[PDB]
Design a binder for this molecule. Sequence first.
Ligand SMILES: Cc1cc2nc3c(=O)[nH]c(=O)nc-3n(C[C@H](O)[C@H](O)[C@H](O)COP(=O)(O)O)c2cc1C
Ligand SMILES: Cc1cc2nc3c(=O)[nH]c(=O)nc-3n(C[C@H](O)[C@H](O)[C@H](O)COP(=O)(O)O)c2cc1C
Ligand SMILES: Cc1cc2nc3c(=O)[nH]c(=O)nc-3n(C[C@H](O)[C@H](O)[C@H](O)COP(=O)(O)O)c2cc1C
Ligand SMILES: [Ca+2]
Ligand SMILES: [Ca+2]
Ligand SMILES: [Ca+2]
Lengths: 639, 638, 305
Amino acid sequence: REVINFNTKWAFTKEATEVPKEMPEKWYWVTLPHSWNEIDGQDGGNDYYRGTCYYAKQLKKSELPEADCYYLELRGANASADVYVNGKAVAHHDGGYSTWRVDITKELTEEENLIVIAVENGVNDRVYPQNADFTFYGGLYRDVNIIAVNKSHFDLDYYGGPGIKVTPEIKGADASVEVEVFLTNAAADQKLVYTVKDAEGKEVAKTETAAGETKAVLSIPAVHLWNGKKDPYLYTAEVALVSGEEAVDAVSTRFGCRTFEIDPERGFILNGEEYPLRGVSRHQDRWGIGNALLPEHHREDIDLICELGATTIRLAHYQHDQYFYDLCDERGLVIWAEIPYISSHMPNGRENTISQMKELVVQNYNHPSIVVWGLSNEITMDEDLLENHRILNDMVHEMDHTRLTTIAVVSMCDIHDPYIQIPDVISYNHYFGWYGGDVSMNGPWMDNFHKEFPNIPLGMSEYGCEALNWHTSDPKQGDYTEEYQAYYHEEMIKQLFTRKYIWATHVWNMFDFGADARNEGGENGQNHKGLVTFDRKYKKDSFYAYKAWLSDEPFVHLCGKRYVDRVEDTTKVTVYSNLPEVELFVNGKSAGKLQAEDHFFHFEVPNVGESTLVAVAGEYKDESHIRKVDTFNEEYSLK
Amino acid sequence: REVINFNTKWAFTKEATEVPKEMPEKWYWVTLPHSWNEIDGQDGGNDYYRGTCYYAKQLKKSELPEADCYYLELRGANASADVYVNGKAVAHHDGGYSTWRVDITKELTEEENLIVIAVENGVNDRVYPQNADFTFYGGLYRDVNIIAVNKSHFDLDYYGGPGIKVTPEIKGADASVEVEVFLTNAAADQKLVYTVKDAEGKEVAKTETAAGETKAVLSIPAVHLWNGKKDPYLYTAEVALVSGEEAVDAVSTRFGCRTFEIDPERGFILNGEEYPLRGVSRHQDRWGIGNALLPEHHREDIDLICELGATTIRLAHYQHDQYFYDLCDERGLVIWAEIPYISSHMPNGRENTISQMKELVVQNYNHPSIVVWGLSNEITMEDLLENHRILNDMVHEMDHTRLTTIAVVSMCDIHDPYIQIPDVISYNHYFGWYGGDVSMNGPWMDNFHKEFPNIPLGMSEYGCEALNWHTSDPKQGDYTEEYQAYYHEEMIKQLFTRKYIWATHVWNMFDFGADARNEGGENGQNHKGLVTFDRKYKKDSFYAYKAWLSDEPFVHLCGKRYVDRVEDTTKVTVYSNLPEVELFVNGKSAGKLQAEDHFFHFEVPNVGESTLVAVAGEYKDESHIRKVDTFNEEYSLK
Amino acid sequence: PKEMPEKWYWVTLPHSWNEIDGQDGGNDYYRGTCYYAKQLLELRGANASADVYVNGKAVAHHDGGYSTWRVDITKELTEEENLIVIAVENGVNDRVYPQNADFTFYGGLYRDVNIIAVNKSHFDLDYYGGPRHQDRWGIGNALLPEHHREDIDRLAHYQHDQYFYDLCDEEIPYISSHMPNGRENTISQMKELVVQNGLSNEITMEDLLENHRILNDMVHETTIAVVSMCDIHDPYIQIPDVISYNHYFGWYGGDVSMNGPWMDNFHKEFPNIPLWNMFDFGADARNEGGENGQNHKGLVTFDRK
Ligand SMILES: Cc1cc2nc3c(=O)[nH]c(=O)nc-3n(C[C@H](O)[C@H](O)[C@H](O)COP(=O)(O)O)c2cc1C
Ligand SMILES: Cc1cc2nc3c(=O)[nH]c(=O)nc-3n(C[C@H](O)[C@H](O)[C@H](O)COP(=O)(O)O)c2cc1C
Ligand SMILES: Cc1cc2nc3c(=O)[nH]c(=O)nc-3n(C[C@H](O)[C@H](O)[C@H](O)COP(=O)(O)O)c2cc1C
Ligand SMILES: [Ca+2]
Ligand SMILES: [Ca+2]
Ligand SMILES: [Ca+2]
């Protein structure tokens, strides 16, 4: 089995009449990943181009390895797509976030075969998402491959799945691992060789069956538990399809061995031990390239999230890339995965909810980082809606006996609504202190639901506050300053991180992200609730509030480095640190030492002329600068 | 080559959760043709179910004659459809009105294969129609067939087309007919036997070539031209694919030999002679069954149109059934066919205009009745202009034998750029119904013909609503049968007298389904027909046209449903294509009229209960009236 | 040049600098940018590309050496003595037709250059200059009225001069090899040709189709001349209103006889589409026949004697 990368140099256009019959010569050249909304869907106006665009590329047999079948594999085509080979339609897919594939062997009738993929992200009542606070970036924004396999091969046709399904059971110190496999055009005389490998590639179990027996149970004695950030230990499972003495096809996947519970009072439990889930959410886009993300972009996002110290990520609002989920498995992050069943129940969207959720579970069952499947987000923003949830919830329980269902509930929805009783666990999306109200309401709002429903495990799946490069010494809801967002998250941390019954918390959001309908805060087309800016270059102060509570990397961080000119004669200077004591020095002389148990060191500092600020904790330091002015620098003010 | 009927007993549901793995047991049974909008799309409130529906049926290999390939053929799935064979997707189609086919041989692996067809007619920005005055009836509303063929066979995969393209050219008393054919998996050592046959089935031309030479030009000595209603003569081309001495596949099509012009001053011309196109439009639906029309329904519609004597039908607003177009060929009607590029240009809609026009032309090229392809209807009600330049060039590229046209909304400025694109244009004017006055129509047409003396100008729509309301004082907006008849009397006098109007089309021949309509006292219908929705009642306006267009002699008494009348002396209209009519009231002559325009306007004493007899030669009609003190408010909508 | 030149060569329009070296062989006629300077605007013939400068400032540029173009100058005439400079260029590029053809691309202001004095409100001047070969031995394309009349006593491959159509009263140079970046020039020269008064010649010696479709739609809102060996079922033949072929059977090999027969076969094939040179003319690449520099498929000599 060979995987050919197929991303290089497609002809692209937005204004093409019909499927072209010859390779276009005046189209725009893109190399996938590509989204055509990389600029117009990150800048405001809710006007990013939505419509059908064409990608065209020639497939030459002289470059393909010799093989019985060739499959076109699409990792991401947002939102709907059709595939033509030498002009004939061979495939249609609805769902911008999952892998789908098609056997194109029969249509490769020429030495040069025109491969045309039409991709559409228009408005309709059928394909989720339609109503949501993010840009539906159109395009082939994930890899396109060609898969060359033998006539008998592991299934490439079942909902974009890998063709292998690993299910570990923990029994004391050992593990029982069921490995199931799915075959296309297999012969009764072929064998299946199942192997499990160690983190160092060392074989630790091996068994064989006839091809008609597509399950096997392998034992792993003295199992290394996947145990989160403490030890994200991963095994590999391999199954080869063997004709006589030779492997004609092989599939593999990594997996981790763990149990968990979501206890309504003790919160998240992992392998029998309490394992608090304190984290963030992440969209799969980035400034300048839309959602056309490279592997290094996925690695940077998770590096920054690891540096903050999050033990969980909510991967809203749709299926992310396989490489990002692998990264979570490798790094020990606990993951919430969901489908874009969002904001507003579309009666005609029901088929597509089913479809996307099947692809979500089938394609991601093997990732040990995932513990919950999310059915919908804020879906109540009614009987048909309830039936859609029953069906999704029973299908997920049908397909996956080892994970729990959840929803993300909109702030205002009555806690006695019937759909809250449907999934195994729930979380709420609250913005008290940002969309009105006050940051102190969150804690008690959660306590009151907990009182009403003591057996429903309750998390916080969204909470957050907007912040851009604006500054103040009087932080207030709606000035959009870095300082108010810092205060907000300090207060959420204090309320949320001390309530063990909150099973998972997810800052909305880890990064600023694309939302073309947003036109607020001084910079349009973006939600700026991030802890880090859209291009990943600037960690806002609120990022270090969380690092001070969740990371064991010793550091000391000076807040307000961008708020330089201050009117006040004595100015507040906040330091965040996971060390026990910080000393602040103003132009070289101590303004005192503090010991903040909640890691929030609030100093008061004379502001005369220009001053250099140095904060010192053990052997770690940070530096900033302020200066005294008579009038407020109107460049700090959004108004 | 065997075509098997596959309409029989599908399981059907409106709840589109998932494609069922096994044949269902508590869905609803339907035999195609079928639309789920047959009731909720004909009754008002714009609320008919739009969404995804499932059809499920078992295909059993034993019941299939043996063959190398099996194609599923769908004649109509409205609007967008996906086909599954044993849970595997094998085709997708957008376009409620055209034939599409898929090879499914490779998926017939069980002895009982589960066919599932998902059909969707919801709201989107991509598939036409989305904005129009008619119900987008969801479903498998035309035949589904299994087509079993030999490994080598005429093309079944190209835009649903027949596999055989027939172009007659004429010069002098003879005809020359090019027959082109398209093959799938043919082998070099195979032959093509082409034949042309008489109306009586006698061979008139024959020739053999090798499977590689897929075009042939056969000659018809002393050809009988297809000449409209006067002689709708059809030949039949057949081509067989032969392996050795054995025909392994054959296709065929009827065709007609005819030339025509659309002269900007002389109007329509057919085989050199002026041939005026005065007629009607026709929607493909019927009260009670939606668009799930049977062949008997197509036959009755065309009978009623022939009885009226139309020489043309505008088959709005989309591709019609092949069987209806065949009737049109057989009866010598001259057809306008069009795609549902309608009301409002969708920027995301370009691709679907292209696909529907390709299918329209590929599947209907052989129909001699068809003279014009319609690009759009009221589309203005720059991306638009490009969209029309693409359609216009593509049709002109595909069909060198027919002209392009459009239907222009009423208020559209006559200098607008898009009017310059097609070969010919027509307007939809409703002066005298949607405001205005009926006298405006002819002069408006005169202005355009002055302003643009060489763009052939037709009237693609005009009409007036009518239900079972009556009055002795017809006014626009009373929805009375009497006002509609007056409107049509005046439109005939204005339109039928202007030779330069190349085609007139009454909107509409029949009342039809429009679920957003909520007026005239019966919601869910456009009541502008000459004939009611169940085809059971000919409104009086039907006869005003018949008197001008039919050669069957008749006399028709208007107002039969207006019995109770208050006035001592009442107006009684007779339509007849005979020169002279005498009308009798209780056996007493109330007057003798000759009317050149066939509209016999009598006045009559109204006393007691009276019986009316209209007499022209040996032809009579009969009606009854009654004198009443007060108006019968049952005759009144308000 | 800032000042009116002193040592340049004086010429009086019409003028081409290829009057001699473009009629004598070797395909070496001077092709490049040349300058005309005058003290003091409409140009009837500036082959092939030109820039007008008034007191030192560009005021108009034109590509197309066969059609009229004007530029309002009223505001640049700022002194009593105004230096008008016209740079004319007939070089090689992939953009301005013609580039490949059997005739000399005689450079210069080979037709009149007038000044038009107009009332402010006026019949318009600025919409594309709107209201046999054109050369002779010894003077290139710098023909005088007398040379038109003597010729009168098919106007390929370009717009001829207004006065000559008048002697007809009383096609663009889209020729030989299709130039992808030449699309705009065929458009501009077609808009010009039709406004102030043939789509292609031998252009096959899909982007090409798109170019024809663009031209045909713009003029209609038509004909081509087809190279001999072209394929009668080529898609582009079904684009214009009518077509005509060019055949040299019996000269470029073969026999005179194949011609009659040949056009018959076409007519049978396409029953619905209706199916050189008067004088010798200048073709500097021609090095055949003992007299190099002329195509001698002419009935009359180059000097019309
Ligand atoms: C995680 C997972 C992966 C699966 N992968 C495959 C597969 O690759 N090929 C296959 O034929 N069946 C696969 N199955 C089996 C299907 O679930 C099975 O066809 C089921 O009966 C169909 O129901 P569904 O439409 O809800 O998936 C998989 C099941 C699960 C839970
Ligand atoms: C009326 C008509 C019917 C046609 N039927 C077929 C056909 O059945 N099979 C086919 O391959 N091409 C058919 N063609 C078109 C030509 O063969 C066409 O140039 C080519 O096959 C595909 O061109 P495309 O890119 O437009 O699809 C048909 C064309 C016309 C005008
Ligand atoms: C033969 C002809 C001559 C024209 N002459 C002029 C003109 O002299 N001045 C003018 O403003 N428009 C003139 N037009 C303007 C037309 O309106 C023009 O073709 C079109 O409407 C828009 O022009 P555009 O190319 O600038 O978009 C002329 C049009 C034609 C067909
Ligand atoms: Ca935008
Ligand atoms: Ca209704
Ligand atoms: Ca020379």
